[PDB]
Write a protein that binds this ligand. Structure first.
Ligand SMILES: Cc1cc2nc3c(=O)[nH]c(=O)nc-3n(C[C@H](O)[C@H](O)[C@H](O)COP(=O)(O)OP(=O)(O)OC[C@H]3O[C@@H](n4cnc5c(N)ncnc54)[C@H](O)[C@@H]3O)c2cc1C
Ligand SMILES: Cc1cc2nc3c(=O)[nH]c(=O)nc-3n(C[C@H](O)[C@H](O)[C@H](O)COP(=O)(O)OP(=O)(O)OC[C@H]3O[C@@H](n4cnc5c(N)ncnc54)[C@H](O)[C@@H]3O)c2cc1C
Ligand SMILES: Cc1cc2nc3c(=O)[nH]c(=O)nc-3n(C[C@H](O)[C@H](O)[C@H](O)COP(=O)(O)OP(=O)(O)OC[C@H]3O[C@@H](n4cnc5c(N)ncnc54)[C@H](O)[C@@H]3O)c2cc1C
Ligand SMILES: CC1=C(CCOP(=O)(O)OP(=O)(O)O)S/C(=C(\C)O)N1Cc1cnc(C)nc1N
Ligand SMILES: CC1=C(CCOP(=O)(O)OP(=O)(O)O)S/C(=C(\C)O)N1Cc1cnc(C)nc1N
Ligand SMILES: CC1=C(CCOP(=O)(O)OP(=O)(O)O)S/C(=C(\C)O)N1Cc1cnc(C)nc1N
Ligand SMILES: [Mg+2]
Ligand SMILES: [Mg+2]
Ligand SMILES: [Mg+2]
Lengths: 583, 583, 583
């Protein structure tokens, strides 16, 4: 007995637990479509309006769940539209399978309609990149692609000539290897190495623990190490929320999508424990230029000593290692360094609250995010686009271990807010989901607001309309000789865009309008998507990478100007607190 | 004395006559931005809302004018968004320069933010693909890119580390080679070869001349050869309009974006003169399977004998060769073959008019295109998206040599309607410009309706809203076993989308609504863009590749069903006319 | 009724006039081998000992005859061994077809033995690069590859799964387009532009005509223009021989594989006519820094203004353009510039003769090449390897239009001497063929001396054994601060290598041994290959790019050291001759 090869391919996807996949049909992929059509009860096809949104959503599925995301594109332009999401998956090292339509084998290499050698298109993005040429082996090739995407934490691409999935193959020969999949059991971190790292950390005068998302399983240990040892915590931006933002010794992140206390403390630290962290600004920003000892914990040999000359680098799991450190230490009394950092954080959080707490007047991003906080459930998921929203969300969202947030961390493709939210709601239909996006990024993927409507995905979309590429405008202010260019543009009314795709929506431009609009949105999103278009000022957010508050470091005139522009009259530099506690 | 390298790069663009260019800024391209900002009087930067639209518009500039189109994208995701337009330019063999942002040379290869080796990304699409590494040679590298894009009729990509354009270079050293550019003077076609081709063509019983856009300069000669010799004309779809559609012996195009008379005549012809033609369906459709002699005229040696075994292939310019044929022939009396084809065309055009001429009821694509015809100026330009609109526009638009029409001919990327119209209006601000697009394709690039508003580009946008990927639905009807999938979707109200980007718009769903809406649109578009969202039926357009009208070829039941579905009761098969005139 | 697809492929090669092709069999290409075996009376397979030699020989075939060269390699390592020859073909812009074995379609993408995705391997080198997936279209794919390689003057690569050539296909369907082949049209010169060019050339005070191999059809015109107008000639190294070396106003080539008079004159010229020339050193050596007017003639628009800004650029065939110049000028009287250059050439040639004319003592390269000249037929063909031999052969070989010489002009891969001579003897069995090679380059392809023996190809191989990479040693002398490294090595006795492959051979180390050995070799090579291993001194050949003879430019100490090292006591700088004639 026989099975169509395409039917077998869909059963391989099912065997691996793929719940949903994204794409747009075409003749060159209609035989995979045909197989999907027969399997609607067991795999859920999501028709997007642009294939980039399918690729981005597949990446987001894997970011959220750790399960492979799946997308497809038709021959030629369908597949090339996947690129921004495939590069996101590559750079954020998450498993994605991409299927690319191709002309049948009888027409390949004939220079027929929309027929090209597609393999070179995907060679750079993909861990695995093959054109299938046989029906009987096609299930194996898909299985191989999936297994490699997982093993190698990246993108597998298969170009499929459209004739193959309509061929009959023997029913009993194909298989999936999902049944073999497992995660490794690791040795203990060695006691001796943990031990010497630990002594160096404890001997420090001005220690910091600086973690990334490799420490995602270690939030409890991080906070308890911090509290017991009196060592402040800082993180990469993506690692926000691993430790609750409310934790009083959480300094935030460094560089620009950053918080003041983290930058200031890092400049003063003598020892940094760098754990589960691949911070891409380390070298270019000279982050560690005056660090005395640099200690690392990472699971990947490729990372050991990568970002700075490392005194001790432990190849181990972050949680297991941090637990092993915790088990060999005990209480230290409060130190001046601890107290100075606590005071600095309190001052900073008072500044952010002063921005949030305005009650009337021209709307700024700060109050919009306060309004999000006010309607957010404790386990909400945030899909965040790319721009000033990363900076502002990093400062204002009040996250805990129960939340998730995703963006395009390293490729930093705009437009990911909408697709990430689609994926979040598909995976977690009982959890509240936000899409927080600037106007520039929302406009790139705006058509796929219709996908939220079509699939009844109750995302709360919040568009930050400044009529700018604000993140880039501020860069031009900093570097460009000549006038601003390409960074200020006409308005788009996203409430009207929403209406056009048949989504309920609101537009607001005044602080006092927020509470009732956000309460209405919270309620609508019990059952249907909603959009809030927040018309915000062009105020530049405080640049944590260009602080002008320390009279030993900056002129009085520069400090006065900084305080004025950034509403920062009550911020004190870290040195004030260092001095207060005798450092 | 010195000049900034970026300033020199902009002067190279100016030297080559580049009027306008497209892109979105980013830090990684802010030094090119800076140079553009100082040169606003002499080069016009168009800020798009998605970089794919900039790439597509650059391709369209070159399709329209023959001048190189220019676009750019920021590092990583800005550049990868260009792909669908770059592949369009490659496949439609038009010159485009693409500039890609990159991290400064001091941070390249550090694994910093959004920093990657960008060169492999563009290797497949590009004729020329380099990463610049020196400021003093950067003007030369841009000059080289332009010169190669022209010479090789394709895409040149330059990745530019952002530090280089801010470096000073000696003022007197750089140059542009635009001053050297010229077009070749060719020899005559040889008299002997033209002569033997001509005899074979004239000896035929059932000749056809089948031209593509390589014959774009030869419309006069084509029509006069046809009339003098009594030889019907057929074309590739893109070659519509080279000879006026009204010409009574213009049969149309073959395959699917096709007209009935062309398919039918081609099946019967004994000799085809294939001129300036690279029809991609030739082999797969067995177009020439019963052609006795196949004659070719083409400028490119790579094309000689490519699509079919060729009896005589003349390497020459199409116009010069067709003129040389015309100069050696004279009047032939009407033949039965001529008369049969004339009769067949009249019957077909009566069918199309019957569809157009309905006055009331549910709106179909056919009447929308009649309404376009009624408001179109004689020299209007049409940017056409990808889908059923190619099929329907091919049949219904009444073009002459004074018109232009463009689509993505071979890559066939959806979304090109909007960008092509932007480019058309930028090049030809005094000419009427239409964007004719299906709902699927319009939705992919809908955000760049805002670019038409921002730049006050008075495009007439007509969206054909069937709530389907209709072209693909019909494919699934033809090939798929299982139910339709991914081809029927929710409505988007493009009048509301238009309102959201601050464009005047209308939505219509009834035939009787068309005249006043189209008259209003015609008037608005004297000064501002406008959009008409035409809600059309799901009726399948007649498939010229699956005709069921000939009782020697098809069952009576199949013919009855075809006539019913396609409103084709009064169409006669070509064989009726052949018989009438004694063949 | 049916034909094997492999048989049809070989028939395509035969239709295109392929006489011989090179490679090494493997399982992965045994079905093409089987088809070759059946066709061995009409197409001739040459089994090489290393696939690189097959690729190099294929490139040399095309360099010599203009006929596409054909090579193949087995899957994986057979094909990757082709690379140095394929890149040679790309860079020297000659047509080559390369066939690459691949696993059968049932085993592709299974990760079986020596099975990989081969398409990305060839993407950079190839103009056309496809994996065949169907037997019936395989003849067309090969035809396409050939037609493109010719039209685009580069490499076409086809990966062939081994099952396809053993499949039956319909006998009637396949064809070759060889019948339709034509070479590109030759554009014609604009008559105004040529008149303006001529005027500028004639108004020059210190003109030069500087041609490359694009002027290979124009030697008569070049020499006559030089004589009529009293304008010296210089060329690219590859263009040596287009005008006979004995012509008294031939200055030679510039840069390093160069002759003194050319460098010196170019530095003083006010007007250069740059014809059929893509000299790669133009910019980096600042060749044209002081040139007032630059006049260019080239067929390729990609070249116009490439190497320097043009004052007049003519997109036309070199011989037609030079003929048109010649036709509008008449005899001009001698000038001071003309006489100064003639005197400089005489002085230079007397130097070279002095080196050649030694009759006893330690053997130098110079006398070896004199001995070559003494046994060389007037229509001899020289295959030249890469290193000091290019420099020395350029100075000493006495070539005329009746000769050919080839090397790897631009990629400059060592090892080409032996394959180029194989190809030359295959294409020109009645012409004398030399392989002139350094010991380093001969070593790299030494095993294919056996191929000359096996096919009874009577090449005269001359190996220049200095026990050095001499060309590179001299570079280290010029740039490196530390001691020589990697450039002096142990001896290989190539007369023993030749004995090992069963080739007659001689080793010489003294000038007085040359005449008898070379006469013996001349006679042996009436019927069989022969090798002369010339043990030469480590003397550095005079560096034409670092002249130290002009006491206005150089210290007496540096002049005296140069004269002593290079036996150049009788050389005078061009300024001596300029001054004699009042310049
Ligand atoms: C517009 C924008 C601007 C940005 N700018 C900033 C900025 O100013 N500041 C900032 O902080 N970020 C910024 N980012 C994000 C930044 O680009 C990097 O993605 C981020 O800093 C790196 O975070 P990470 O190290 O947590 O994650 P990753 O780069 O994913 O690294 C995770 C590390 O954990 C290790 N690992 C994984 N699992 C384990 C385990 N079980 N045990 C141990 N180790 C493990 C990995 O091997 C790896 O080294 C920005 C993002 C955007 C969108
Ligand atoms: C959705 C969609 C469906 C389509 N399906 C169809 C269809 O059913 N039917 C159809 O006809 N098209 C169809 N097309 C277009 C099709 O893909 C090809 O692009 C088109 O048929 C080729 O047209 P062409 O030969 O005129 O142009 P090109 O492919 O650009 O070829 C031009 C030829 O002219 C030669 N040339 C150039 N200049 C000269 C000169 N001066 N003198 C002589 N020769 C010269 C070139 O060398 C080349 O061979 C479709 C397009 C779309 C978007
Ligand atoms: C070890 C080594 C060192 C070398 N160093 C030197 C050196 O010091 N000096 C030196 O001179 N060379 C040197 N070379 C060779 C050098 O690398 C270049 O290959 C050579 O200078 C370029 O020669 P060309 O312009 O004649 O050929 P090409 O680069 O092949 O250019 C031919 C030109 O002719 C044009 N053309 C073709 N047909 C026509 C036509 N019908 N009419 C008009 N134009 C036409 C083409 O478009 C092209 O621009 C060296 C080679 C080796 C192996
Ligand atoms: C234009 C832009 C950005 C502007 C985003 O504008 P938004 O309007 O979305 O956000 P805001 O800052 O105004 O709130 S940020 C980004 C950097 C971080 O890479 N770039 C460059 C960029 C350009 N194009 C794409 C597709 N993705 C990108 N990341
Ligand atoms: C989905 C689709 C098409 C549907 C277009 O839907 P539209 O709604 O735009 O048009 P209509 O037919 O309903 O009037 S046509 C096309 C073929 C010709 O390639 N494809 C495949 C396709 C898929 N994705 C992109 C970006 N471009 C493509 N060409
Ligand atoms: C090693 C070397 C050269 C040394 C050649 O040594 P030879 O011993 O052959 O010649 P000679 O100079 O001693 O007479 S020249 C060359 C340059 C021109 O590229 N290179 C670099 C080189 C290195 N490797 C290969 C395969 N090809 C090359 N061209
Ligand atoms: Mg914005
Ligand atoms: Mg549609
Ligand atoms: Mg040597």
């Amino acid at each position: 007995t026989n099975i169509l090869a395409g039917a077998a391919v869909i059963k391989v996807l099912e065997a691996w637990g793929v719940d949903h996949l994204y794409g747009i049909p075409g003749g060159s992929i209609n035989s995979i479509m045909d197989a999907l059509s027969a399997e609607r009860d067991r795999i859920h096809y999501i028709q997007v309006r642009h294939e980039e949104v399918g690729a981005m959503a597949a990446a987001a599925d894997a970011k959220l769940t750790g399960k492979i995301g799946v997308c497809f594109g038709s021959a030629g332009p369908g597949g090339t539209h996947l690129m921004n999401g495939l590069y996101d998956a590559r750079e954020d090292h998450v498993p994605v399978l991409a299927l690319i339509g191709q002309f049948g084998t009888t027409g390949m290499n004939m220079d027929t309609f929309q027929e090209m050698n597609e393999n070179p298109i995907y060679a750079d993005v993909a861990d695995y990149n093959v054109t299938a040429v046989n029906a009987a082996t096609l299930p194996h090739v898909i299985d191989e692609a999936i297994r490699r995407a997982y093993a190698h934490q990246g993108v597998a691409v298969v170009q499929i000539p459209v004739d193959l999935p309509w061929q009959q193959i023997p029913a009993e020969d194909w298989y999936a290897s999902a049944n073999s999949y497992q995660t490794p059991l690791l040795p203990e971190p060695d006691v001796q190495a943990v031990t010497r790292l630990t002594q160096t950390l404890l001997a420090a005068e001005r220690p910091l623990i600086y973690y990334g998302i490799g420490a995602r399983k270690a939030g409890k240990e991080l906070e308890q190490l911090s509290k017991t040892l009196k060592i402040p915590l800082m993180s990469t931006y993506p690692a926000k929320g691993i430790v609750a933002d409310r934790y009083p010794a959480y300094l935030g992140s460094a560089n620009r999508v950053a918080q003041k206390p983290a930058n200031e403390a890092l400049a003063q630290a003598d020892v940094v424990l760098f754990v589960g962290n691949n911070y891409p600004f380390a070298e270019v920003s000279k982050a560690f230029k005056n660090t005395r000892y640099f200690l690392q914990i990472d699971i990947d040999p490729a990372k050991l000593g990568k970002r700075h000359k490392t005194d001790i680098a432990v190849l181990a799991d972050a949680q297991k290692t941090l637990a092993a450190i915790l088990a060999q230490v005990s209480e230290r009394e409060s130190t001046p360094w601890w107290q100075a950092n606590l005071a600095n954080v309190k001052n900073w959080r008072a500044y952010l609250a002063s921005l949030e707490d305005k009650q009337e007047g021209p709307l700024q991003a700060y109050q919009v995010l306060r309004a999000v906080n006010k309607i957010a459930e404790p386990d909400a998921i945030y899909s965040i686009d790319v721009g000033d929203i990363n900076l502002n969300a990093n400062r204002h969202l009040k996250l805990t271990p129960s939340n998730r947030h995703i963006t395009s961390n390293l490729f930093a493709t705009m437009g990911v807010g909408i697709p990430g939210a689609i994926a979040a709601k598909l995976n977690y239909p009982e959890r509240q989901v936000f899409n927080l996006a600037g106007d520039g990024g929302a406009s790139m993927t705006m058509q796929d607001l219709a996908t939220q409507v079509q699939y009844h995905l109750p995302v709360i979309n919040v568009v930050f309309t400044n009529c700018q590429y604000g993140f880039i405008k501020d860069e031009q202010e900093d570097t460009n000789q000549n006038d601003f260019i390409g960074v200020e543009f006409n308005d788009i009314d996203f409430s009207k865009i929403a209406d056009g795709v048949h989504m309920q929506a609101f537009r607001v431009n005044k602080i006092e309008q927020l509470p009732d609009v956000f309460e209405q949105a919270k309620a609508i999103a019990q059952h249907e998507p909603v959009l809030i278009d927040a018309v915000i000022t062009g105020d530049r957010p405080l640049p944590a990478e260009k602080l002008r508050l320390d009279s030993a470091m900056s002129s009085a005139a520069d400090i006065e100007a900084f305080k004025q522009r950034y509403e920062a009259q009550d911020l004190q530099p870290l040195s004030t607190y260092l001095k207060q506690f005798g450092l």
